[PDB]
Amino acid sequence: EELLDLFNRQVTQEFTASQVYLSASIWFDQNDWEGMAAYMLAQSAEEREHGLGFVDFANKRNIPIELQAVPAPVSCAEWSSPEDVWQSILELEQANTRSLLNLAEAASTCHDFAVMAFLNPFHLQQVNEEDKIGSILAKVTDENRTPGLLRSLDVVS
């Protein structure tokens, strides 16, 4: 069943995103961007909580869960500036949104009303998340046009 397989891959996707946020924290902390690092660390935790949510629902609903590897984050190897990091995180959130939308499609095809209901808050959360990341990325891209200025976003905010 497409639906059971996708529900499992959603758990992996949440944990994958958690680890990618952790890699963003690390790059920021290594590069003395402690404010952005804390933001990424908080978002790492929150993603993991989302994965845990999906696991809990699956257990209740008898959707078998088999935990997959969480792959090593790949984007950090090539980030060189905060703009690079934030662009990768926007791309992650966009991918997280698609995965959830595909899962909802599969649920809709199956008439799985409970799964569709469970997913509603996550669809609305993703709208907010993509908006928030895109907005920070816009500020970062504007501020980084003047040397040193972005270092103000971090220290302030």
Place this chain on the structure above:
Amino acid sequence: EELLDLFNRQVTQEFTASQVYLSASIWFDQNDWEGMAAYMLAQSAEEREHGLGFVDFANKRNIPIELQAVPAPVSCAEWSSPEDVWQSILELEQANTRSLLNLAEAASTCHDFAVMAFLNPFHLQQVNEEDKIGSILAKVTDENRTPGLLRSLDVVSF
């Protein structure tokens, strides 16, 4: 119309479930499982509340409600152990779930977005209810393997 019929039948299923839980509470009380009896009594009241919620929504949405009989419960003629009661209550919740899904399917066919939205919290509640009853039945079935041990479920929890 199918949606209107299924929405009435839902009120009926909630009130019928309420009575079946009441029946289970009686069986337990009569057999000195006061803890399981109190649990069933609480669930009886809650399933009546769900029915009342459906009635309220229907009144607001001009869905005509014709209250049907609540049939005499009959599974409590045959119960001879707590496991038998909990199995029936599991089957009851599985029937409750099915009736909500039937109603949602009809709302979906009709593009009745308001009804589908109203139903969402009930779909999620049924997931929790079937899980919870399933888990209790697993405990009962395991503990009843040693004589007297299930009386500990009743006294300790519940």
Place this chain on the structure above:
Amino acid sequence: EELLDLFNRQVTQEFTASQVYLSASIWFDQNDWEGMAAYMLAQSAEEREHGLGFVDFANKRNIPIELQAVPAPVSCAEWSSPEDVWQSILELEQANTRSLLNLAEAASTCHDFAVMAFLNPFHLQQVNEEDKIGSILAKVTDENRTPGLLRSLDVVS
């Protein structure tokens, strides 16, 4: 450099352990041992926090961290009773202890006093964790000699 490699592997081991504990919670929840499931979930969180503490220290100490894959837990394929799960968790904590000891050994060799100091509370925590898991496993093993008895004591927890 051996100390750096080992410090990275320790991060990996904490996050691996975190995932094995999650696996344990899933098995328990699926088999209606909700109390044991909650215990495993809490431990899963805590071992991820340990990982985070290693990453934080590394960042401060300029120990480069590159996040590795977190492997798929595999023991939940073979579990068929709580005893099996708790035994795998004991072995996991024994392995967590060994990785910390390998790390400390390398730091000692390198005369890395700060790393050794950082490790001390973890060495002491591992004593506690192996003792606690050993104690639960003994209790589980003894209670399950009578059908149903073990269930009655997940329920009291």
Place this chain on the structure above:
Amino acid sequence: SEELLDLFNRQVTQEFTASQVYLSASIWFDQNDWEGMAAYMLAQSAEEREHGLGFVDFANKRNIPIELQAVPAPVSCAEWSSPEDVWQSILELEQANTRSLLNLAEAASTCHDFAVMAFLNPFHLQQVNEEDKIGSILAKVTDENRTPGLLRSLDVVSF
């Protein structure tokens, strides 16, 4: 006092027109990720609408007929490209708002309508404060916008 009754009715429209232009500014700022400036505009939008409601309440009490007109579509958003453009349009809006109220007070003065002139006094003084506040913001925005990225500071810190 047909002139006066007319202009008083017309002042409701002006307040609601201003409310919508502020809303428009809030939208432009949100769409372009100036959430601080967007919140300021949204608040002013609400306050403009309250001013209109005050006019309506007073008219009801004074038996000045109110007939609600179309609230015109804001149009300056088509051509805004930077925050400076937006704030300049909002200054123009407030200057127009001030003139409309002074034209109304002129018609009242002519009619010896002491009550209407008294009703308007706090509004004349509010407009003084609002043109000053907007002009001051526009001066800041214009200066900060001389260095790339710096204005994005104002939004994030202040606002």
Place this chain on the structure above:
Amino acid sequence: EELLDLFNRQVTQEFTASQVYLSASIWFDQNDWEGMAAYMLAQSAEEREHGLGFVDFANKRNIPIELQAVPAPVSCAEWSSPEDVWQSILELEQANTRSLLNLAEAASTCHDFAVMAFLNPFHLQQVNEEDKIGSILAKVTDENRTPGLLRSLDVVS
């Protein structure tokens, strides 16, 4: 003996450092960087307190202490900008860490477990102090790329 001489010279190093931090406060104050000046003054007091801790332990352990002169700070004649000050302070903390690491080596060689235990919090504090100073220096160095911008680090933060 060498452990005893090194313990004495650790006291001197702490007081030396306190005076270098004082010098940094003076340069900042003189050049109207009141925020950085306050940071340096606070760090000067703290390093004097570390020296006092060493003295107190020495007295307890019958390690004779003979207070040495506190040398005049020398870097404060060359400093021309905040970057130069923070760089000298990083170097000071790097020297602080090396002095503690030499003392720990001597104690290790002597099997002096009490001295090693006493030093552990200091080892971990140095990790934090070098990270914090290095991070500030990174911020200073970036922000100073734009005329006047650094003067906002100070007044704001």
